[PDB]
Design a protein around this ligand. Structure first.
Ligand SMILES: CCCCCCCCCCCCC/C=C/[C@H](O)[C@H](N)CO
Ligand SMILES: [K+]
Ligand code: NA
Lengths: 263, 252, 61, 289, 238, 99
């Protein structure tokens, strides 16, 4: 388990596009959807399946409004020309027993430039833009004391709360179904295709076997679905013959045995 | 007669015949740093007489509707010969200045300019909380012009003549060493300004020492047959310049 | 280690003056205020020029 | 001498008024030249006939030490003795004289100043609204801690960074005299830079203004006592008194209003106030009733 | 120990104290002093310096640079009035936001003589005369030119010397005057009248600008410290 | 400062005739904030296409997923057109029934 927060703000947004969006991540899949056009976060209803009455959605709303005010404040101090993208990685992870380790990272135009030093409680970087934004965020002078407690007494609290409130929604387990096929290619060659449908943990290892000997890993392709299930696919270029010999062995946490798949 | 003044520095000489006086700072003449007030532990670079000469800035045109101009001399002289190159290879620097403003007309013209040198003239932005770019504070060559109303541009200095870009009354701004160019009597303005800072030596690209401002209080006005183009020329000379901390070429 | 100085009395008429002061701490920043220094110098701001004027001459021509 | 100690004993009165009479000569004190930056020094005896007035006025209470050395409030601190969120039980404040415009303008008369600080804390506790109104809580105890820039920083009210083995701290018991202590010149430069026309980085980018030369560290405030049974808030008021004051290179006072605490940015306010017209005349069938 | 009796007035906090207090940074090394030019030991070094007076306080001219220009021209009459204002450095709106008024708004009482430097900013061939007058109180504002020359006046001719200093003396019955507008400590009136007209040659413009200054003399003093009525804020500056 | 994207067009359920299915177009590894992605049913744009939230990966690069509901057919094919800053022409990716 590792709680993460993906915050993203832009300078000049498109019409119909929000200028600020937050996505929360309890491990592999999303549980939060916040935007600047509405003013509140909405769940996906697959974690607690229960209405938390006004002490879970009236606090995250105010915290993300504070983060929205800070990130929209953090575009006026830059005198550059082009558009901006201020991404932020804010979260924590649980240790052995207690004393969770948080993580605060910031990036402008796809490159990391500053973090948040917890010992001195101050945003710190190397660039002049880093010092400018870090100096502008302490002009509000009541925000560093809020992030210093948000990453050390609110996020581990929410992490230990979602540790045992939704334990049935942390034990996701389905066996992935294989459809191993092939396709013709350039004269003399062919391309195999090993797929993997609707497996819930992200870890999956694929490999190719000619008869009983390994032939490589191929090219890994991975993608989430719109409900939490994950899809994988891989391919390998082989000769025009030998296509009746390949038996791609797949192992996964939802399978108790490396099930051999025949075309 | 005390109307004729001939100031000679380096290999350059300015001779005027309708001068007024010379305001020399706050009574203090520019001099080198003493051995008691020194901080660094190496010999300063006192280069030559080729860095203490009169360099002539670009001229501006003063119409009837003109409002003012402002320069930034530790950034304006970054390309003026060996005074500029010694800025690029060194870290520190210390110099006083002598500023001579030429503005000529005939006896048929009327108008009056105020020539001030304001130390630590921190400029306010046009918008409330936006950041000011470096090209709108200083330019090197031809200066930035005051506006007549509430200026509001993207990432720009607030340009108001009744606030002078700082938020103070412009009539009370004559507490600094100042002169007047009155076309009834005067032809030029000479101001000698020593080094005014809380440190003995400071960087010359990062810190702006002072700001010249030429503001017309009595506006330019003339007949239907007089000369129309009245230029204003600024000629500045460093004095007692010294440098410290030699390294590679700095930031332009 | 005491010191004796005059008070701020009235004007034109008038024991009741010459108070005492004793410093108790080992630092110069711990001392009291300096509210007795009346020395001014209006020569750096007024008349900040060379070729000093005479105030009876027209100071031109 | 300098300004610390060990005798002043100097009373400097104003100049007197010498008598004069009729005059008809080429000595004209009225005809001057204000274009040379020269403030004229016309005595009233030079223009009209005056008498011998022995003036006993002293320019005493108009000096800089007699103008700045009064305790003005700079910041209010509010924090409670028990809460559910730990950011409202302790309090921090980055030290600046920029959030109250009175003492800010009094320092912004001058560009560079050099002084010692006299800090006084006035602490007032208010019982918050709750169900258990009737309590028997003893006298509260407050801790005020100073942190130099770069030192360790507490994260809660029960952190072990409040031991203060090197950091100075004041323990106040409720009901006693207010805490007061003196602080020397802790600046790096030779004087406090009020206005700094300069950048932060060498490429003339980053932040602009006097926002780089504060570097003073910050204050922290907490209740020494443990978790109570009813919430009680406390508000302290920081009073700075600048003594041993020297000042250099003045400037005109601010005309417009302030906007923020780290820049000189403003909205354009006018010069003065109109009345009706340009000239004056007599009354208007007098209405001073 | 020592029998010590506590006096009334103990354990309080007065604003203007002169007491001692311990140092939170013991044996701290203060950096040495450097000779910075322009040292101020008295605020009277600022108030004796000339500063341009916003005389032109007609509306729509305050939010411009026109507020400091005093307009003058050639008049077909020979006894008209140029300008005029009450002598209240801190209560009148003419010299309210001026540097002398900016000093005297922190001081309730003031006393001393006032200088007013008037420079002429016209063409080099224009000439004329003016009557700069000051009227003590007791009577109203003078409406003619003969009623204004019964006070303390000067007749100034425009020539090579472009400036003129009207030196308003100290004519009072008390040793001090309140800076706020009251009935008891009335001060007087500043008036300016056309002595002659402005003679202008051909192909030279007529309308020109007179500028005004203000400064204190060597016998000026202020007594009571108070807060200025201009500093107004609602919340903090965070 | 430019990252060219990567397109993956796939399906959740196997392509069985008569049964409903979900088409997924997943673009990843790019850093403009704007992208113009459409789904095509043999050249005709699908009208009702819902979306997911625009998050980013560990390398500070975006990813966006579009999804729709369809019925798979041997004759019917699908495409995912992506207009991007790096693309001078809108890249069209044909849906594979196995990948
Ligand atoms: C144990 C000590 C606690 C109290 C600490 C608070 C006061 C000490 C902080 C340093 C004093 C700086 C006061 C302001 C100095 C300059 O005037 C400003 N930078 C603006 O001019
Ligand atoms: K005397
Ligand atoms: Na004279």
């Amino acid at each position: 388990l590792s709680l993460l927060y993906h915050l993203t703000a832009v300078s000049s947004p498109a019409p119909g596009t929000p200028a600020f969006w937050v996505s929360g991540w309890l491990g592999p899949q999303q549980y939060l959807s916040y935007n600047s056009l509405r003013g509140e976060a909405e769940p996906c209803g697959a974690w607690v399946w229960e209405n938390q009455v006004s002490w879970y959605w009236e606090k995250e709303t105010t915290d993300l409004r504070i983060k929205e005010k800070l990130f929209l404040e953090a575009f006026k101090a830059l005198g550059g020309k082009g558009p901006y993208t201020l991404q932020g990685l804010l979260g924590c992870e649980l240790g052995p027993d207690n004393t969770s380790v948080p993580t605060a990272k910031f990036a402008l135009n796809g490159e990391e430039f500053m973090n948040f030093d917890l010992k001195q409680g101050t945003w710190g970087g190397d660039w002049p833009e880093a010092l400018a934004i870090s100096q502008r965020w302490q002009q509000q002078d009541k925000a560093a004391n809020k992030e210093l407690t948000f990453l050390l007494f609110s996020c581990p609290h929410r992490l230990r709360e979602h540790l045992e409130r939704g334990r049935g929604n942390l034990e996701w387990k389905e066996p992935p179904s294989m459809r191993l096929k092939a396709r013709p290619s350039s004269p003399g060659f062919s391309v195999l295709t090993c797929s993997a449908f609707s497996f819930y943990p992200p870890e999956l290892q694929l490999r190719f076997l000619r008869n009983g000997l390994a032939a490589g890993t191929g090219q890994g392709d991975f993608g989430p679905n719109s409900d939490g299930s994950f899809h994988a696919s891989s391919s390998l270029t082989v000769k025009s013959g030998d296509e009746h010999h390949y038996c791609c062995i797949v192992q996964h946490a939802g399978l108790a045995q490396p099930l051999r798949v025949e075309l | 007669s005390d109307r004729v003044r001939s100031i000679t520095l380096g290999n350059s000489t300015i001779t005027t015949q309708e001068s007024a006086n010379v305001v020399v700072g706050y009574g203090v003449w520019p001099d080198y740093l003493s051995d008691e007030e020194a901080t660094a532990e190496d010999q300063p670079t006192q280069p030559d007489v080729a860095t203490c000469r009169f360099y002539t800035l670009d001229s501006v045109s003063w119409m009837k509707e003109s409002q003012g101009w402002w320069w930034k001399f530790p950034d304006a002289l970054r390309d003026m010969g060996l005074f500029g190159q010694n800025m690029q290879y060194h870290y520190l620097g210390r110099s006083g200045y002598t500023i001579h403003v030429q503005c000529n007309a005939s006896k048929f013209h009327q108008g009056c300019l105020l020539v001030v040198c304001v130390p630590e003239a921190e400029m306010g932005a046009a918008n409330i909380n936006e950041k000011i770019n470096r090209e709108h504070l200083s330019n090197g060559e031809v200066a930035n012009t005051f506006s007549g109303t509430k200026s509001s541009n993207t990432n720009d200095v607030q340009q108001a003549v009744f606030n002078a870009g700082m938020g103070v009354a412009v009539g009370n701004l004559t507490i600094f060493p100042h002169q007047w160019i009155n076309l009834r009597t005067n032809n030029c303005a000479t101001i000698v300004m020593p080094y005014i800072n809380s440190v003995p030596m400071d960087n010359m690209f990062r810190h702006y020492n002072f700001t010249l401002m030429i503001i017309p209080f009595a506006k330019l006005d003339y007949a239907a047959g007089s000369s129309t183009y009245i230029p204003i020329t600024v000629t500045v000379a460093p004095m007692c310049a010294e440098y410290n901390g030699l390294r590679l070429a700095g930031h332009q | 280690g005491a010191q004796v100085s005059t008070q701020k009395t009235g004007a034109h008429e008038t024991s009741i003056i010459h108070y005492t002061n004793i410093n108790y701490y080992k630092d110069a920043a711990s001392n009291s205020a300096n509210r007795q220094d009346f020395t001014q110098d209006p020569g750096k701001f007024t008349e900040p020029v060379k070729d000093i004027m005479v105030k009876s001459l027209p100071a031109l021509n | 001498n300098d300004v610390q100690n060990a005798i002043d004993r100097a009373v400097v009165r104003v100049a007197d008024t010498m008598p004069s009479g009729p005059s008809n000569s080429e000595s004209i004190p009225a005809l001057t030249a204000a274009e040379t930056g020269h403030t004229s020094q016309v005595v009233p005896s030079d223009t009209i006939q005056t008498r011998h007035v022995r003036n006993f006025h002293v320019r005493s209470e108009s000096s800089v030490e007699n103008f700045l050395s009064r305790s003005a409030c700079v910041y209010i601190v509010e924090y409670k003795t028990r809460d559910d969120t730990p950011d409202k039980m302790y309090d921090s404040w980055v030290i600046n004289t920029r959030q109250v415009a009175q003492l800010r303008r009094k320092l912004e008369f001058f560009t560079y100043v050099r002084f010692d600080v006299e800090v006084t804390f006035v602490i007032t506790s208010v019982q918050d609204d709750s169900t258990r109104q009737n309590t028997d809580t003893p006298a509260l105890t407050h801790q005020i801690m100073y942190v130099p820039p770069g030192g360790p920083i507490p994260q809660a009210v029960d952190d072990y960074n409040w031991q203060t083995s090197t950091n100075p701290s004041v323990f106040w018991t409720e009901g006693n005299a207010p805490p007061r202590m003196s602080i020397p010149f802790m600046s790096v430069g030779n004087a406090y830079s009020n206005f700094y026309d300069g950048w932060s980085h060498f490429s003339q980018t980053g932040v602009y203004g006097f926002n780089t030369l504060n570097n003073m560290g910050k204050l922290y405030f907490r209740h020494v006592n443990d978790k109570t049974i009813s919430p009680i808030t406390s508000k302290v008021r920081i009073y700075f008194k600048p003594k041993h004051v020297k000042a250099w290179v003045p400037r005109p006072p601010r005309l417009c209003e302030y906007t923020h605490k780290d820049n000189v940015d403003f909205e354009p306010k006018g010069v003065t106030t109109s009345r009706t017209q340009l000239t004056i005349s007599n009354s208007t069938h007098v209405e001073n009733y | 120990g020592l029998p010590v009796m506590n006096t009334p007035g103990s354990n309080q906090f007065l604003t203007s104290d002169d007491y001692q207090s311990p140092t939170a940074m013991p044996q701290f090394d203060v950096t040495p002093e450097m000779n910075i030019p322009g040292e101020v030991k008295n605020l009277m070094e600022i108030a004796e310096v000339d500063s341009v007076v916003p005389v032109n306080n007609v509306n729509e001219n305050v939010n411009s640079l026109e507020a400091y220009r005093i307009p003058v021209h050639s008049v077909t009459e020979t006894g008209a009035q140029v300008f005029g204002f009450t002598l209240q450095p801190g209560a009148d709106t003419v010299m309210e936001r001026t540097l002398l008024g900016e000093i005297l708004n922190y001081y309730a009482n003031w006393s001393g003589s006032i200088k007013l430097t008037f420079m002429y900013c016209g063409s080099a061939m224009a000439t004329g005369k003016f009557l700069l007058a000051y009227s003590p109180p007791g009577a109203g504002v003078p409406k003619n030119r003969r009623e204004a020359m019964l006070g303390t006046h000067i007749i100034w001719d425009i020539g090579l010397q472009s400036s003129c200093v009207l030196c308003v003396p100290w004519i009072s019955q008390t040793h001090y005057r309140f800076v706020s507008k009251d009935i008891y400590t009335d001060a007087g009136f500043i008036t300016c009248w056309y002595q002659t007209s402005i003679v202008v040659p051909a192909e030279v413009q007529n309308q020109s600008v007179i500028l005004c200054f203000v400064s204190a003399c060597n016998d000026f003093s202020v007594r009571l410290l108070r807060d200025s009525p201009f500093v107004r804020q609602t919340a903090f500056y965070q | 400062i430019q990252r060219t994207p990567k397109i993956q067009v796939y399906s959740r359920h196997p392509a069985e005739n008569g049964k409903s299915n979900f088409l997924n177009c997943y673009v990843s590894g790019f850093h403009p904030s704007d992208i113009e992605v459409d789904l095509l049913k043999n050249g005709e744009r699908i009208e009702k296409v819902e979306h997911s939230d625009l998050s980013f990966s560990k390398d500070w690069s975006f990813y966006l997923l579009y999804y729709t509901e369809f019925t798979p057919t041997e004759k019917d094919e699908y495409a995912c057109r992506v207009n991007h800053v790096t693309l001078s022409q809108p890249k069209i990716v044909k849906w594979d029934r196995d990948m």
